Amino acid sequence: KVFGRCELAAAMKGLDNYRGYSLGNWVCAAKFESNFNTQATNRNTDGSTDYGILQINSRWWCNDGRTPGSRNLCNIPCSALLSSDITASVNCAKKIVSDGNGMNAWVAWRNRCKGTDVQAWIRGCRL
């Protein structure tokens, strides 16, 4: 499913201020990570693949059966992260952001959202 900005913001309200990260940060990351598309996937140089709305990596978080040495810390097959229901992505994202590096774990957030007016991303949305 390709989400609308405000639609995704409402879907992501459980992440609003989680670990101190305002909702705008989460919507901005999704935009630049998957362009609001739950079915997005990207293979990396190291053989791992990023999945879904938040492009969660198969090396540590989910199992895709083709990433040798993978850890599957979120205990889910990566395909669960491609569903139109983003719950699994939201619950795995919570573990990742708690890992110690915060949202810096998402390269697109670090390079395109961090230190910007992220409030603009939920502007106009009825929450």
PDB file of C-alpha atoms in Angstrom:
ATOM      1  CA  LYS A   1       0.000   0.000   0.000  1.00  0.00           C
ATOM      2  CA  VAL A   2       1.206   3.517  -0.860  1.00  0.00           C
ATOM      3  CA  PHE A   3       0.161   5.772   2.026  1.00  0.00           C
ATOM      4  CA  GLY A   4      -0.878   9.386   1.970  1.00  0.00           C
ATOM      5  CA  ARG A   5       1.083  11.705   4.289  1.00  0.00           C
ATOM      6  CA  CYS A   6      -1.680  12.380   6.829  1.00  0.00           C
ATOM      7  CA  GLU A   7      -2.979   8.809   6.509  1.00  0.00           C
ATOM      8  CA  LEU A   8       0.430   7.447   7.469  1.00  0.00           C
ATOM      9  CA  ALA A   9       0.776   9.992  10.323  1.00  0.00           C
ATOM     10  CA  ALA A  10      -2.470   8.720  11.870  1.00  0.00           C
ATOM     11  CA  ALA A  11      -1.338   5.116  11.321  1.00  0.00           C
ATOM     12  CA  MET A  12       1.902   5.951  13.111  1.00  0.00           C
ATOM     13  CA  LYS A  13       0.507   7.686  16.202  1.00  0.00           C
ATOM     14  CA  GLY A  14       1.819   4.958  18.517  1.00  0.00           C
ATOM     15  CA  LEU A  15       5.305   6.256  17.564  1.00  0.00           C
ATOM     16  CA  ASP A  16       4.450   9.877  18.404  1.00  0.00           C
ATOM     17  CA  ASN A  17       7.105  10.943  20.899  1.00  0.00           C
ATOM     18  CA  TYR A  18       8.311   7.404  21.472  1.00  0.00           C
ATOM     19  CA  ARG A  19      11.839   7.714  22.820  1.00  0.00           C
ATOM     20  CA  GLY A  20      11.428  11.451  22.443  1.00  0.00           C
ATOM     21  CA  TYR A  21      10.864  11.378  18.711  1.00  0.00           C
ATOM     22  CA  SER A  22       7.939  13.490  17.541  1.00  0.00           C
ATOM     23  CA  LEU A  23       5.643  12.064  14.888  1.00  0.00           C
ATOM     24  CA  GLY A  24       7.065  14.348  12.195  1.00  0.00           C
ATOM     25  CA  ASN A  25      10.402  12.489  12.476  1.00  0.00           C
ATOM     26  CA  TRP A  26       8.710   9.156  11.695  1.00  0.00           C
ATOM     27  CA  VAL A  27       6.729  10.451   8.745  1.00  0.00           C
ATOM     28  CA  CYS A  28       9.828  12.194   7.318  1.00  0.00           C
ATOM     29  CA  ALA A  29      11.892   8.956   7.609  1.00  0.00           C
ATOM     30  CA  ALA A  30       9.169   6.891   5.847  1.00  0.00           C
ATOM     31  CA  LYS A  31       8.947   9.408   2.996  1.00  0.00           C
ATOM     32  CA  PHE A  32      12.658   9.237   2.340  1.00  0.00           C
ATOM     33  CA  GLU A  33      13.047   5.539   3.123  1.00  0.00           C
ATOM     34  CA  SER A  34      10.202   4.059   1.091  1.00  0.00           C
ATOM     35  CA  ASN A  35       8.296   6.975  -0.362  1.00  0.00           C
ATOM     36  CA  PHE A  36       5.327   5.857   1.792  1.00  0.00           C
ATOM     37  CA  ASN A  37       5.222   2.428   0.017  1.00  0.00           C
ATOM     38  CA  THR A  38       4.894  -0.618   2.299  1.00  0.00           C
ATOM     39  CA  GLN A  39       6.114  -2.935  -0.458  1.00  0.00           C
ATOM     40  CA  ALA A  40       9.492  -1.270  -0.898  1.00  0.00           C
ATOM     41  CA  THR A  41      12.588  -3.460  -0.755  1.00  0.00           C
ATOM     42  CA  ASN A  42      16.257  -2.694  -1.461  1.00  0.00           C
ATOM     43  CA  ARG A  43      19.272  -5.008  -1.569  1.00  0.00           C
ATOM     44  CA  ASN A  44      22.447  -3.766  -0.014  1.00  0.00           C
ATOM     45  CA  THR A  45      26.098  -4.401  -0.945  1.00  0.00           C
ATOM     46  CA  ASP A  46      26.533  -6.776   1.972  1.00  0.00           C
ATOM     47  CA  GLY A  47      23.775  -9.098   0.723  1.00  0.00           C
ATOM     48  CA  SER A  48      21.150  -7.956   3.238  1.00  0.00           C
ATOM     49  CA  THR A  49      17.857  -6.386   2.151  1.00  0.00           C
ATOM     50  CA  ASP A  50      15.810  -3.501   3.608  1.00  0.00           C
ATOM     51  CA  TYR A  51      12.055  -4.024   3.905  1.00  0.00           C
ATOM     52  CA  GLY A  52       8.932  -1.948   4.028  1.00  0.00           C
ATOM     53  CA  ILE A  53       7.753   1.480   5.018  1.00  0.00           C
ATOM     54  CA  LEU A  54      10.790   1.982   7.316  1.00  0.00           C
ATOM     55  CA  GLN A  55      13.257  -0.135   5.317  1.00  0.00           C
ATOM     56  CA  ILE A  56      14.149  -2.415   8.200  1.00  0.00           C
ATOM     57  CA  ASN A  57      17.310  -4.501   7.557  1.00  0.00           C
ATOM     58  CA  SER A  58      17.494  -8.298   7.353  1.00  0.00           C
ATOM     59  CA  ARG A  59      21.001  -8.503   8.892  1.00  0.00           C
ATOM     60  CA  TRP A  60      19.729  -7.778  12.417  1.00  0.00           C
ATOM     61  CA  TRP A  61      15.989  -7.373  12.597  1.00  0.00           C
ATOM     62  CA  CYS A  62      14.022  -9.766  10.440  1.00  0.00           C
ATOM     63  CA  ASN A  63      14.525 -13.139   8.842  1.00  0.00           C
ATOM     64  CA  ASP A  64      14.425 -13.447   5.057  1.00  0.00           C
ATOM     65  CA  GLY A  65      16.342 -16.722   4.797  1.00  0.00           C
ATOM     66  CA  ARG A  66      19.050 -15.354   2.506  1.00  0.00           C
ATOM     67  CA  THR A  67      21.140 -13.163   4.776  1.00  0.00           C
ATOM     68  CA  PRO A  68      23.835 -15.429   6.306  1.00  0.00           C
ATOM     69  CA  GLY A  69      24.608 -14.534   9.900  1.00  0.00           C
ATOM     70  CA  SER A  70      21.290 -12.660  10.314  1.00  0.00           C
ATOM     71  CA  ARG A  71      20.018 -12.206  13.898  1.00  0.00           C
ATOM     72  CA  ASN A  72      16.219 -11.654  13.530  1.00  0.00           C
ATOM     73  CA  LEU A  73      15.980  -9.548  16.711  1.00  0.00           C
ATOM     74  CA  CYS A  74      12.386  -8.577  15.937  1.00  0.00           C
ATOM     75  CA  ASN A  75      11.441 -12.250  15.517  1.00  0.00           C
ATOM     76  CA  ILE A  76       9.525 -11.913  12.255  1.00  0.00           C
ATOM     77  CA  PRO A  77       9.936 -12.888   8.599  1.00  0.00           C
ATOM     78  CA  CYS A  78      10.857  -9.800   6.632  1.00  0.00           C
ATOM     79  CA  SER A  79       7.756 -10.255   4.441  1.00  0.00           C
ATOM     80  CA  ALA A  80       5.600  -9.290   7.422  1.00  0.00           C
ATOM     81  CA  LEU A  81       7.118  -5.810   7.037  1.00  0.00           C
ATOM     82  CA  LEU A  82       5.591  -5.414   3.549  1.00  0.00           C
ATOM     83  CA  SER A  83       1.972  -5.721   4.703  1.00  0.00           C
ATOM     84  CA  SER A  84      -0.526  -2.890   4.252  1.00  0.00           C
ATOM     85  CA  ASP A  85      -1.034  -3.145   8.047  1.00  0.00           C
ATOM     86  CA  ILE A  86       2.057  -1.448   9.424  1.00  0.00           C
ATOM     87  CA  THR A  87       1.815  -2.819  12.987  1.00  0.00           C
ATOM     88  CA  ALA A  88       4.778  -5.185  12.620  1.00  0.00           C
ATOM     89  CA  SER A  89       6.913  -2.319  11.225  1.00  0.00           C
ATOM     90  CA  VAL A  90       5.824  -0.091  14.082  1.00  0.00           C
ATOM     91  CA  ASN A  91       6.641  -2.714  16.741  1.00  0.00           C
ATOM     92  CA  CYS A  92      10.027  -3.567  15.228  1.00  0.00           C
ATOM     93  CA  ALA A  93      10.864   0.128  14.754  1.00  0.00           C
ATOM     94  CA  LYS A  94      10.299   0.584  18.522  1.00  0.00           C
ATOM     95  CA  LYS A  95      13.011  -1.978  19.270  1.00  0.00           C
ATOM     96  CA  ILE A  96      15.479  -0.451  16.772  1.00  0.00           C
ATOM     97  CA  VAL A  97      15.069   3.120  18.107  1.00  0.00           C
ATOM     98  CA  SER A  98      15.665   1.774  21.613  1.00  0.00           C
ATOM     99  CA  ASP A  99      18.926   0.057  20.504  1.00  0.00           C
ATOM    100  CA  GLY A 100      21.103   2.980  21.541  1.00  0.00           C
ATOM    101  CA  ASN A 101      21.659   4.999  18.358  1.00  0.00           C
ATOM    102  CA  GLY A 102      18.110   6.290  18.216  1.00  0.00           C
ATOM    103  CA  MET A 103      16.751   7.245  14.816  1.00  0.00           C
ATOM    104  CA  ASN A 104      20.352   7.527  13.474  1.00  0.00           C
ATOM    105  CA  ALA A 105      19.835   3.853  12.654  1.00  0.00           C
ATOM    106  CA  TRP A 106      17.890   5.166   9.625  1.00  0.00           C
ATOM    107  CA  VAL A 107      20.392   6.703   7.229  1.00  0.00           C
ATOM    108  CA  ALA A 108      17.676   8.703   5.387  1.00  0.00           C
ATOM    109  CA  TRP A 109      16.468  10.225   8.668  1.00  0.00           C
ATOM    110  CA  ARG A 110      19.990  11.165   9.648  1.00  0.00           C
ATOM    111  CA  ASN A 111      20.707  12.761   6.269  1.00  0.00           C
ATOM    112  CA  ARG A 112      17.396  14.365   5.391  1.00  0.00           C
ATOM    113  CA  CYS A 113      15.230  14.785   8.477  1.00  0.00           C
ATOM    114  CA  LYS A 114      17.549  15.299  11.403  1.00  0.00           C
ATOM    115  CA  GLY A 115      17.585  18.992  12.304  1.00  0.00           C
ATOM    116  CA  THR A 116      14.932  20.089   9.873  1.00  0.00           C
ATOM    117  CA  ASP A 117      11.497  21.419  10.691  1.00  0.00           C
ATOM    118  CA  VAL A 118       9.911  17.963  10.828  1.00  0.00           C
ATOM    119  CA  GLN A 119       6.708  19.474  12.142  1.00  0.00           C
ATOM    120  CA  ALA A 120       5.931  20.413   8.531  1.00  0.00           C
ATOM    121  CA  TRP A 121       5.301  16.711   7.810  1.00  0.00           C
ATOM    122  CA  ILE A 122       2.158  16.435   9.945  1.00  0.00           C
ATOM    123  CA  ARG A 123       0.992  19.941   9.186  1.00  0.00           C
ATOM    124  CA  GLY A 124      -2.611  20.029   8.034  1.00  0.00           C
ATOM    125  CA  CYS A 125      -3.386  16.563   9.328  1.00  0.00           C
ATOM    126  CA  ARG A 126      -6.274  15.892  11.703  1.00  0.00           C
ATOM    127  CA  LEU A 127      -4.719  13.770  14.435  1.00  0.00           C
TER     128      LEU A 127
END
